[PDB]
Amino acid sequence: TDADIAQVQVQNKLQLAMPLLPQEVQQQGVSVEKSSSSFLMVVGVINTDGTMTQEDISDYVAANMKDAISRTSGVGDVQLFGSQYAMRIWMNPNELNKFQLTPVDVITAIKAQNAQVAAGQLGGTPPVKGQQLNASIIAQTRLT
Amino acid sequence: PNFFIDRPIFAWVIAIIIMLAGGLAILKLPVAQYPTIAPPAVTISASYPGADAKTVQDTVTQVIEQNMNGIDNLMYMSSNSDSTGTVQITLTFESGTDADIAQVQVQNKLQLAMPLLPQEVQQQGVSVEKSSSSFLMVVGVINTDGTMTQEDISDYVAANMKDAISRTSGVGDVQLFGSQYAMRIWMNPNELNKFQLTPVDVITAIKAQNAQVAAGQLGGTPPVKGQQLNASIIAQTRLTSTEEFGKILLKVNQDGSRVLLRDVAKIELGGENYDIIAEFNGQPASGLGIKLATGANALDTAAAIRAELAKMEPFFPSGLKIVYPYDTTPFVKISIHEVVKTLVEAIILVFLVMYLFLQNFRATLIPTIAVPVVLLGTFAVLAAFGFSINTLTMFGMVLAIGLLVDDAIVVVENVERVMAEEGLPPKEATRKSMGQIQGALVGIAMVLSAVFVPMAFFGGSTGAIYRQFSITIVSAMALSVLVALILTPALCATMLKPIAKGDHGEGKKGFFGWFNRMFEKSTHHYTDSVGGILRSTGRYLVLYLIIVVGMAYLFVRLPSSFLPDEDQGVFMTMVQLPAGATQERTQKVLNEVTHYYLTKEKNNVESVFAVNGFGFAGRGQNTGIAFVSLKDWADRPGEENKVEAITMRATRAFSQIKDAMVFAFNLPAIVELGTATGFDFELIDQAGLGHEKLTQARNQLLAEAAKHPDMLTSVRPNGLEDTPQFKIDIDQEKAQALGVSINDINTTLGAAWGGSYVNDFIDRGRVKKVYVMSEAKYRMLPDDIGDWYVRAADGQMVPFSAFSSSRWEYGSPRLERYNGLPSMEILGQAAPGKSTGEAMELMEQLASKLPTGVGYDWTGMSYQERLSGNQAPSLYAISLIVVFLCLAALYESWSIPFSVMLVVPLGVIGALLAATFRGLTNDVYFQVGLLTTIGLSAKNAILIVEFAKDLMDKEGKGLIEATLDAVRMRLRPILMTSLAFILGVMPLVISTGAGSGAQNAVGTGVMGGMVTATVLAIFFVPVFFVVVRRRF
Amino acid sequence: EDTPQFKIDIDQEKAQALGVSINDINTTLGAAWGGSYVNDFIDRGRVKKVYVMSEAKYRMLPDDIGDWYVRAADGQMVPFSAFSSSRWEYGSPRLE
Amino acid sequence: PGADAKTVQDTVTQVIEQNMNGIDNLMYMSSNSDSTGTVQITLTFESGTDADIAQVQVQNKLQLAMPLLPQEVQQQGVSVEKSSSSFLMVVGVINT
Amino acid sequence: GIKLATGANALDTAAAIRAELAKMEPFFPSGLKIVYPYDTTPFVKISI
Amino acid sequence: ERLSGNQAPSLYAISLIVVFLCLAALYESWSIPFSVMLVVPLGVIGAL
Amino acid sequence: LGTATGFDFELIDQAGLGHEKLTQARNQLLAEAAKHPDMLTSVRPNGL
Q: Family, per the entry (chain C)?
């Protein structure tokens, strides 16, 4: 069978199911691959002078190496032995109680205080006759 | 061979089938200016209305990129992120990748990344398209009455033209220049604050009141027993009128008085976006970009498009015209007609050279039947290999008439010489003479194929070009040797009249043939002058070495090129105002550009399509472009009236008057090419280091490049410099206290200053968008923030100044990424002296000493040229060995082949001598031209050596005697071909007008090569043989 | 052939005046007459649909509209005859 | 869901058909629009055409129209498939 | 852990993955090393 | 049907040409085919 | 694709019996398969 068409056809169906899945599932990214079962190879990464932990190394691989490898033609699947860094907010319930707060409030705060915002432009188009200035209006950007 | 001498009817039948198959091919073959040459590239496009370069990047660009995996044959990926809110991600695939599969693979990886992009982006859509910039035609649609604006025009084109044009046969794609209408709601903040309402209220109302509402049906299943009637219940449907949007209720005051959208906002049909303003000769302009459908006829499709446009003419509104700024068709028409003219004028010149050399009206008809059978047969072959009739295939055939004509002449002449020498009857003379040439013809065919086929195997974009010439020539040459073995001898046997022994036509006719005496004296003089220069032979080998050294020296000092520039009836100038320039400020400059071309180039310039907003650097109010159509060649007589000169004084004119940078140039033949002597560099951020640290490093490289003007010239970044930008800081603590919603704040700023795509509505039976944005005057200066108010929970209205603060800063209007990582693109070229490779190496050396974490790569043509540069010597090494081998087999020697292979330089020298003194360039048409010249140079020699070896082996003649007999009996045909061929190329050397760039490139090298090839080999070939044939 | 259509004009103006939500009036008419697909359940180990719709006898005639009530923002029940007109229209169920 | 034939024709069908240009070997095209809000567009190709390339070329063009389609249509999924026209067989099931 | 796409050439892809890895090594943080704990490829080459 | 009807005259045109061309190639005569071609209508009438 | 002499059996619920009924059906199969040692070896669930 043509592996390309096998994928194309499969995916055409998956997409009918796609909007019926839970949001939490969708935004984790559903993937459709055309791969061999077994590993071609394992590329391992260590640190000689011992200046970064395995989670540091995992993040590096994920942030600096993976994408390029997975884009390489003939690479059907890439598995990371470890995880990429994320912003970890480890909640304390005693303190959450202590202040009359729930994880729901934490989530609601972060969504609003950590956002990219499209704010439009100064002297944007269509302008008034005679406009002399034109700049981006920058508002809220993601935290770092 | 002998088979068909006794079967002239069989041979005629074979000829007839070839004619029919070729006629059927020529009739239903695709035609286009050029075939596909560029590696397939899929472009992902997206727009986040009101977003900045950083917002699009971090929200759309990065996310999508991070999901382009498990896709086959990806070469590289690059992207942009403009503060026009737009993202473009281009994925380029390996040569020969299936474009359709590529685009599908890309589109459904994107499909799985959609739920991760913001909803404003999702609802705008994400384009995924094949990116072949080739247009067949650009149709401009303009108004002259001054009644409709480019927005009105655009919508008319959408609803009453586009569909119909895309239905037209051979039309593969139709891009609209402009938007379909949008419901445009321009908001007034004064009026909003009066009734204490926000854009948020404006949006909510529109969604409530312009919506589709699923209801149900009467008598719907499962029904009651004995149900009477079943009909659909229709609840709320979408609005239509601009009047209806005005009637929507926003708020009812405490005294019961209504507040409508009409009362807070201007409501009108308008453009989806106002970023570009296009003008044709100063007047409002929209248009369609038309692409030619794969496999279709460019000529017929043009004719059809124009015919469909003629039907619609009487149905247009008062003032609207259809104009044609860009049409590739007129140019193609010329290329084809001028190629067929060369071919036919080549056949007539065989007729004339055959007749005024063999004085026999029946003998002259044989090659007149032979070459048209071959030519038609060639078309049949191209059809069978899916090729098309295009500039490259058509100039392939003109390049091949030297070989096709030669096969027809050599066969016929030999029979004519055999009868005039010995006295045998026509059929028997044909039998005998064919026995003298057969093996040699079957050998030459193997040799010629061994010089052409290898170039079909060149890689990348150039290889795709070289293949076109290769297969076209190979197939033509193969068929002509087959016709030489099948058809020509049958004709030579049946329609050729006998000649009495030792005739030579000396004396005879008066008023017609006095030239036989004159020709016979010279051919005796020549064989005298050869025998004498066969004495001291070791001194002629020295002259040869000077010819070799001279060839080597002219090879190095002839500049390289791809394809010659053409006066394609069109060019374009580009406009660049300094960063942060207003639309109006660029409009002024474009107006002046148009005034120059219509005032001072009134006689030449037909039209000036100014596009204010779109540019080649980026997009924005800052930049524009001005496309120039011309009165056709027929009206532009001299050299100063051609594109090269027009554009040069245009760039001169704008340097001494402007405060903005206004270039002027003409487009390359294949409209996706590199500058030959120019490169495409990409600087990469490989560690953490941000945008600024990269900018730092780029400046380090740029400055270092200026340190070497002797090696690199005009080295520059392709991107954009950092501009100031206006940052508003929402105090979250202050906002919470006053009671304003953080999201109410954000969308009130967004909707007003950026625009906000609310809804769809149905305009005259067509779904179009609904936008809400502030009126122009309340969103211009930073002082206008004071006009905008948000409503807090406790009811009251709150100014931005209460919860926000602002300050300026430098940001980036255009962020670039290459293969996933932050990039900055650098263009540049090798200095007037040096080559691209030498420049590229110096570039790599400079980049090796940049700040730790900075990397680099080559993209575009620099990437192409890198992967296919170690091929030219390797392939033509395999060419020679096969040529030697074939020849060894042909004869019965490992040495004898050398005598013919030493001819190679004799043709090349005069080609180089022609191109250098004509100031022409070493391009593709020159390379393929060269191979043609060597082709005959070998052919001429192979037969001479063959004749000498047979007279030596079969009759026991001496070496010094046989070579003299061979050069003599073959003096005639060489001169006959080389007269007809040089005169057939005559007009192609000195030519002006359309397509002359290529015609010159083909002709010059061929005529100069064919002069030295033949008026040199006739002395050197009999020398080569004797020299080689003396070490044994 | 062209079919009759029953057009209901849910008056937004009169709907707010009585307190009722515009969404509440929509999804009551919609779910009663057309049915609504709420979510999924598990029948014998297989995921199937859950639909909510009127009993046949209250969604057959123009006069059956009256039977349905919407709750206002205060708490009392408001009939459709309070905030909606209705009329007949034509149009094709199948456009080729 | 719940759109009349006129609504879906110029809201869904037209949008798709416009982009349905620039596809190799297309012999002709036909379509329907329902009172049930169903649209079916059929691209019929030249004899001999590779149906798997047809499918790919169609869905490539379709996925340009997708943006401009109503969200309701978008979240209902849009299928592109090689279609027959008539049934090979009709298997029947009854209880005795 | 890398898995071949269906039908892709094992040797060619391994070749490409190595080439990719060579592009990255120069820009690594201090003392960060690539190591090859599992590769089915060197067998196929030597085997032949 | 419409396509089948339109090609039909072109079908016989080439088929009669191809047979005539074949016969000339087999029997070295240019006119021997002319006489056998005249037998076509004798058969065709029987079909109709 | 292949182990010397190994099979790959799949037990399937075709009447909507459920997880726990299928489990009871599995254990019964495995029991019987242990009662034939001179035919089957290592008849095991591959799952959890």
A: Belongs to the resistance-nodulation-cell division (RND) (TC 2.A.6) family.
For tokens 């515009």, name the residue. Answer: C22
Burial per residue of A68-86, b for 16 or more beta-carbon CB atoms within 10 angstroms, e otherwise: bbbbbbbbbbbeeeeeeee
> Which experiment gave this structure?
X-ray
Amino acid found at B297 = N
CB–CB contact B234 D4 (8 Å): yes
Under DSSP, the state recorded for B73 is T
List, in sequence order, the alpha helices (H) in B258-400.
Answer: 261-264, 298-312, 328-358, 365-384, 391-398
Determine if the peptide bond prior to B222 is cis (ω within 30°). Answer: yes
Bridge partners (DSSP) listed for residue B171: B292
Write out the E strands in F1-48.
none
In degrees, rounded to 5, the angle at the alpha carbon of residue B957 between the alpha carbons of residues B951 and B960 is 100
Which CATH number fits the domain B723-811, given the four candidates 3.30.465.60, 3.30.2090.10, 1.10.10.10, 3.60.150.10? 3.30.2090.10
- B510-567+868-1032: CATH class: mainly alpha
Optimal mutation site among E9, E12, E27, interface B, most CBs of chain B within 10 A: E27
CA B489-B495-B497 angle, to 5 degrees, is: 105
Contacts of A116 (CB under 8 A, 6+ apart): A140, A141, A142, B54, B55, B58, B59, B118
Which two tokens mark A120?
């439009």
Q: E27 CA to chain A: closest CA distance, Å? A: 10
Count the Cβ atoms, other than its own, within 10 Å of residue D90. 5
Q: Would you tell me the crossing angle of helices B460-485 and B365-384 to the nearest 10 degrees?
A: 140
Architecture of domain B132-178+275-327: 2-Layer Sandwich (3.30)
**Which chain D residues are Cβ-neighbours of A9 within 8 angstroms?**
55
Helices B515-531, B996-1028: axis angle to 10 degrees equals 50
Residue B625's closest CA among B578, B593, B581, B668?
B593
3-state secondary structure of B221: coil
Q: Which fold has domain B37-131+812-819?
A: Alpha-Beta Plaits (3.30.70)
Chains that touch E (3 or more CB pairs under 8 A): A, B
Tell the CATH topology of D1-83.
Alpha-Beta Plaits (3.30.70)
Location of each CATH 1.20.1640.10 domain in chain B: 1-36+328-509, 510-567+868-1032
CA distances (Å), origin B49, targets B58, B272, B285: 15, 11, 24
Class of domain A83-144: alpha beta
Pairing of strands E32-39, B767-774: unpaired
Q: Tell me the CATH number for domain B673-722+820-867.
A: 3.30.70.1440
Question: Which amino acid, residue A130?
Answer: G
Q: How many helices and strands in chain G, by DSSP H and E?
A: 1, 0
According to DSSP, the residues that pair with B712 across neighbouring strands are: B830
Resolution at which this structure was determined, Å:
3.0
Is there a contact between D57 and B762 if contact means CB atoms under 8 Å apart? no
| E/C Cβ contact: 3+ pairs below 8 Å | no
Q: How far apart are CA A13 and CA A20, in angstroms?
A: 12
D76 touches chain A (CB under 8 A): yes
Residue B548 burial (CB < 10 Å; 0-12/13-18/19+)? middle
Select from A65, A125, A131 the residue whose CB has the most chain B CBs within 10 Å, as the one to mutate to test that interface: A125
How many Cβ atoms from other residues are within 10 Å of residue E6's Cβ?
A: 17
Is residue B108 within 8 A of residue B64, CB to CB? The reply is no
G16 to chain C: which residues are within 8 Å by CB?
44-46
Instruction: Classify residue A112 by burial, with Cβ atoms within 10 Å: 0-12, 13-18, 19+.
Output: middle
Torsion sign over Cα B907, B909, B912, B918: negative
Distances (CA, A) of B371 to B294, B346, B374, B409: 31, 10, 5, 10
